[PDB]
Structure 1
């Protein structure tokens, strides 16, 4: 199928309490597979999915040295950015980084990503051409000119077209059914009287992967959009996801209501009832 790999870095300054904390996580699609934390006792890249565990010592050692160097680089970036914005040297600030690749079923690169936020606001981003930058403001233009002089876009493009695509291909090969084959939801409807005249119907989707899902209540096969309570999709903690949708109905009218479930793992969309 189509697949993505993403790395997410967070650096948070803490002036007076030492160097910024740097955290990295890596994902294939909706599966976290690595972490690094600069505050760990002996910081190293650690596995977080079973199929990455087979990578040899050279992998872990290379990646650990990268994160240690990136933490120092982000520390310099946070110092430069509080200067660009004329900000107090006492305050805590956040630098976030997000990069990686989207590939099609043949493993070919569809899109590369390399972008940054400062204190939760977009700062600079590599354009879809993988050759030019979009800067948010005059501070980010300082970074843009520095990165143009250093030929940073060519370095990012080499990774995104090269190591990103090749390593994602590898992970999909080693992760087999865990990454390639969607896990459909386990579904059920519950019923909760509110009063003699009103009841809640709640449609559950549990244990599904990936996270993308649609749950809708219908009355006689028509969507009840404006009357459905829908919770945000949430992690079960075992790499699968949960969601529910609820509707309040007149007591004795439950039979008019059906829950429609759309998920990649389902052979076809499900229609569920209170039963």
Structure 2
């Protein structure tokens, strides 16, 4: 059981509609805690989780360090868009997107499990730092321009330094400073609703509301037989208050409801639940 500090960068051009835009968000597990948007008047790194409102007293240079980092990053991806556009011999007319995802996965006692730094151009893989954190994989011929640049500059070592160092150290600071929010293991609120459609066919919908973290498993069973192939599993959604929701639906023979059970697996649950429906 690990925790994660992950960052997400999106920089897209407005080919005739202002300079490019740069947006960066940071996550600890499934909770967002920081943001940066280059469109603001004088853009700054800003808190998005409660415990981040105390980082100014705990680290008096955190906001200016990261604001300077993000504003700098916005500049280099602005140029990066033009470089990559020339790599593919693309015109100035279209809009294009650079995406970046990096962070660390850390096991219980503060031990690093894996770092990563992956980038995409127009929604497809471009270059990624390998698992040994010492080499890059370019996805196409155009990305070999970037890989040759980054190899000769030794950028993999600087990435490994961060991923093995500050990434683990700040995931630990965040975990402890935000233990209330992050180490939370809230089970879902579960219940089964009902929507007949015929005098002859009926929908059973098994809900799970307000759970954190996002990982959850909903399974429908008929007399102990898994009905995964026959159910309608909706994509998990953010509840708007730092938690999540998800339901699984089945269509059953009317009158034969009590042979169907909903199996719910969540981390903040004592044991997996088996749910029947009852009038």
Give the aligned partner of residue 204 of structure 1: 207
Equivalent residues of 1:25, 1:34 under 8 A apart? yes
Q: Using the TM superposition, give the Cα deviation of residue 226 of structure 1 relative to its aligned residue in structure 2, in angstroms.
A: 2.0
Separation in structure 2 between the aligned mates of residue 78 and residue 103 of structure 1, nearest angstrom: 32
Give the drift of 1:195.
1.8
In the alignment, which of 64, 67, 72 is matched to residue 61 of structure 1? 64
TM-score by length of 2: 0.96
Q: How does 1:93-242 map to 2 (within 5 A)?
A: 93-242=96-245
Decide which moves more: 194-203 or 98-107: 194-203
- Residue by residue over 1:210-246, the C-alpha shift from the partner in whole angstroms, topping out at 9 and shown as x without a partner, is 1111101111111112221110111111110100001
Give how far 1:264 is off: 0.6
Given that 1:191 and 1:274 are in contact with CA atoms closer than 8 Å, whether structure 2 keeps it comes out as no
The equivalent residue for 2:258 is 255
User: Displacement, 1:139?
Assistant: 1.2
Indicate if the aligned counterparts of 1:216 and 1:259 stay in contact, CA closer than 8 A.
yes
Across the two proteins, how many residue pairs are aligned to each other? 275
In 2, the alpha carbon distance for the partners of 1:152 and 1:18 equals 31
Partner residue, 1:33: 33
TM-score computed with the length of structure 1 as normaliser: 0.98
Coordinate RMSD, CA, aligned? 1.0
**Distance in 1, Cα, partners of 2:205 & 2:18:** 49
Kindly state the Cα deviation for residue 41 of structure 1 after the two structures are TM-superposed: 2.6
Paired with 2:205 and 2:94, the residues of 1 have a C-alpha distance of 46
Gaps of at least 5 residues in structure 1 are none
Q: Distance in 2 between matches of 1:258 and 1:15?
A: 54
Partner secondary structure for residue 62 of structure 1: helix
Kept after mapping to 2: 8 A contact 1:85/1:139: yes
Specify the alignment match of 1:7 in structure 2.
7
Name the SS for the 1:196 alignment partner.
Answer: coil
> Does the alignment pair 1:92 with 2:95?
yes
Q: For the residues of structure 1 that align with 2:178 and 2:118, how far apart are their CA atoms?
A: 27
- 1:267: Cα distance to partner? 0.4
Gaps of 5+ in 2: none
What's the secondary structure of 1:55's corresponding residue?
helix
